Protein backbone atom coordinates (compact mmCIF):
# COMPACT_ATOMS: atom_id res chain seq x y z
CA UNK A 1 0.00 0.00 0.00
CA UNK A 2 1.88 3.04 -1.30
CA UNK A 3 -0.61 5.54 0.08
CA UNK A 4 -0.09 7.93 2.98
CA UNK A 5 0.77 6.68 6.44
CA UNK A 6 -2.45 8.05 7.95
CA UNK A 7 -4.72 5.87 5.80
CA UNK A 8 -6.63 3.01 7.40
CA UNK A 9 -8.44 0.40 5.36
CA UNK A 10 -8.92 -3.27 4.63
CA UNK A 11 -8.75 -5.30 1.44
CA UNK A 12 -10.13 -8.74 0.70
CA UNK A 13 -7.92 -10.87 -1.54
CA UNK A 14 -9.76 -13.76 -3.14
CA UNK A 15 -8.32 -16.46 -5.37
CA UNK A 16 -11.13 -18.34 -6.98
CA UNK A 17 -10.49 -21.72 -8.57
CA UNK A 18 -11.88 -22.08 -12.11
CA UNK A 19 -15.64 -21.71 -11.99
CA UNK A 20 -17.97 -21.27 -14.93
CA UNK A 21 -18.38 -17.58 -14.08
CA UNK A 22 -15.82 -15.15 -12.72
CA UNK A 23 -16.85 -14.09 -9.19
CA UNK A 24 -17.57 -10.38 -8.95
CA UNK A 25 -19.68 -9.89 -5.81
CA UNK A 26 -17.82 -9.71 -2.50
CA UNK A 27 -20.15 -12.44 -1.23
CA UNK A 28 -19.19 -14.64 -4.19
CA UNK A 29 -15.52 -14.06 -3.38
CA UNK A 30 -15.82 -14.40 0.39
CA UNK A 31 -16.50 -18.09 -0.23
CA UNK A 32 -13.31 -18.77 -2.21
CA UNK A 33 -9.73 -18.74 -0.90
CA UNK A 34 -9.47 -15.24 0.54
CA UNK A 35 -7.51 -13.29 3.13
CA UNK A 36 -8.20 -9.87 4.64
CA UNK A 37 -5.33 -7.36 4.62
CA UNK A 38 -5.42 -4.58 7.21
CA UNK A 39 -3.39 -1.49 6.35
CA UNK A 40 -1.21 -0.49 9.29
CA UNK A 41 2.42 -0.09 10.21
CA UNK A 42 3.76 -2.91 8.04
CA UNK A 43 2.77 -2.19 4.47
CA UNK A 44 2.96 -5.42 2.47
CA UNK A 45 0.99 -8.63 2.18
CA UNK A 46 2.11 -11.76 0.37
CA UNK A 47 -0.98 -13.66 -0.74
CA UNK A 48 0.36 -17.06 -1.77
CA UNK A 49 -1.85 -18.54 -4.49
CA UNK A 50 -2.27 -22.28 -3.88
CA UNK A 51 -1.51 -24.87 -6.50
CA UNK A 52 -4.94 -26.38 -6.98
CA UNK A 53 -4.88 -28.41 -10.18
CA UNK A 54 -5.53 -32.03 -11.14
CA UNK A 55 -2.39 -32.44 -13.22
CA UNK A 56 0.91 -32.29 -11.37
CA UNK A 57 2.37 -29.73 -13.79
CA UNK A 58 0.17 -27.02 -15.23
CA UNK A 59 0.68 -25.73 -18.74
CA UNK A 60 2.50 -22.41 -18.56
CA UNK A 61 0.92 -21.03 -21.74
CA UNK A 62 -2.83 -21.21 -22.23
CA UNK A 63 -2.78 -20.01 -25.83
CA UNK A 64 -5.25 -22.71 -26.88
CA UNK A 65 -8.97 -22.70 -27.84
CA UNK A 66 -10.03 -20.77 -24.78
CA UNK A 67 -12.75 -20.65 -22.13
CA UNK A 68 -13.08 -19.03 -18.72
CA UNK A 69 -9.51 -19.74 -17.89
CA UNK A 70 -8.04 -22.19 -15.49
CA UNK A 71 -6.39 -21.63 -13.15
CA UNK A 72 -9.09 -19.25 -11.98
CA UNK A 73 -8.97 -15.62 -10.94
CA UNK A 74 -7.19 -13.47 -8.41
CA UNK A 75 -9.28 -10.50 -7.30
CA UNK A 76 -8.57 -7.57 -4.96
CA UNK A 77 -11.78 -6.42 -3.26
CA UNK A 78 -11.85 -3.38 -1.04
CA UNK A 79 -13.76 -4.50 2.03
CA UNK A 80 -14.04 -1.27 4.00
CA UNK A 81 -13.41 2.05 2.31
CA UNK A 82 -10.09 3.80 2.89
CA UNK A 83 -10.74 6.47 5.51
CA UNK A 84 -8.29 9.35 5.05
CA UNK A 85 -7.98 12.36 7.37
CA UNK A 86 -8.51 15.84 5.88
CA UNK A 87 -5.79 17.24 3.61
CA UNK A 88 -4.65 13.80 2.40
CA UNK A 89 -4.67 12.72 -1.27
CA UNK A 90 -7.70 10.88 -2.54
CA UNK A 91 -7.16 7.61 -4.45
CA UNK A 92 -4.01 5.96 -3.05
CA UNK A 93 -2.11 3.27 -4.94
CA UNK A 94 -1.65 -0.45 -4.23
CA UNK A 95 1.59 -1.44 -5.90
CA UNK A 96 1.39 -5.10 -7.00
CA UNK A 97 4.26 -7.59 -7.22
CA UNK A 98 4.39 -11.19 -8.42
CA UNK A 99 7.04 -13.59 -7.16
CA UNK A 100 7.29 -17.36 -7.01
CA UNK A 101 6.89 -19.53 -3.95
CA UNK A 102 9.42 -21.68 -2.21
CA UNK A 103 8.05 -24.64 -4.18
CA UNK A 104 7.68 -23.19 -7.68
CA UNK A 105 9.24 -25.57 -10.15
CA UNK A 106 9.60 -25.44 -13.92
CA UNK A 107 9.99 -28.15 -16.53
CA UNK A 108 10.58 -28.71 -20.28
CA UNK A 109 12.35 -25.83 -22.07
CA UNK A 110 10.82 -24.72 -25.36
CA UNK A 111 11.97 -22.31 -28.04
CA UNK A 112 11.23 -18.79 -26.93
CA UNK A 113 9.19 -16.14 -28.68
CA UNK A 114 11.73 -13.92 -30.50
CA UNK A 115 9.23 -11.06 -30.75
CA UNK A 116 11.04 -8.91 -28.18
CA UNK A 117 13.41 -7.76 -30.92
CA UNK A 118 11.02 -6.47 -33.59
Partner 1 sequence: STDNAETGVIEAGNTDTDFSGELAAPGSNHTNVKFLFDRSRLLNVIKVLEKDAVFPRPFPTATGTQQDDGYFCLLTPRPTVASRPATRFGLYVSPSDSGVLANTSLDFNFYSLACFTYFRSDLEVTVVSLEPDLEFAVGWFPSGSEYQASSFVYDQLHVPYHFTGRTPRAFASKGGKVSFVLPWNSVSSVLPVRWGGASKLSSATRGLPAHADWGTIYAFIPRPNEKKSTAVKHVAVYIRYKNARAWCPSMLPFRSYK
Partner 2 sequence: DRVTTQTAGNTAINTQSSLGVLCAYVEDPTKSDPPSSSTDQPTTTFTAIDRWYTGRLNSWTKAVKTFSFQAVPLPGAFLSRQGGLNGGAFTATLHRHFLMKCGWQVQVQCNLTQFHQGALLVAMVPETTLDVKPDGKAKSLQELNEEQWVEMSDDYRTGKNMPFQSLGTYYRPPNWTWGPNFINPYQVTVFPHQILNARTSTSVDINVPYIGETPTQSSETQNSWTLLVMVLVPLDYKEGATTDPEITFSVRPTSPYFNGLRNRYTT
Contact between residue 93 and residue 7 where contact means Cβ atoms under 8 Å apart: no
Strand order across the 36-38 sheet:
36-38, 8-16, 73-83
Cα–Cα distance measured from residue 32 to residue 19, given in angstroms and rounded to the nearest whole number? 10
- Residue with Cβ nearer partner 2 (81 or 116): 81
Among 44, 81, 95, 102, binds partner 2 (CB under 8 A): 81
- Contact letters (x/-) for partner 2, 38-77, by CB under 8 A? x-xx--------xxxxxxx---------------------
Least separation in angstroms between CB 114 and partner 1: 4
Amino acid sequence: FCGPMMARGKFLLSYSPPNGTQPQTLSEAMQCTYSIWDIGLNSSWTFVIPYISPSDYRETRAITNSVYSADGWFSLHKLTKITLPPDCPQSPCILFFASAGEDYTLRLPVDCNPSYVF
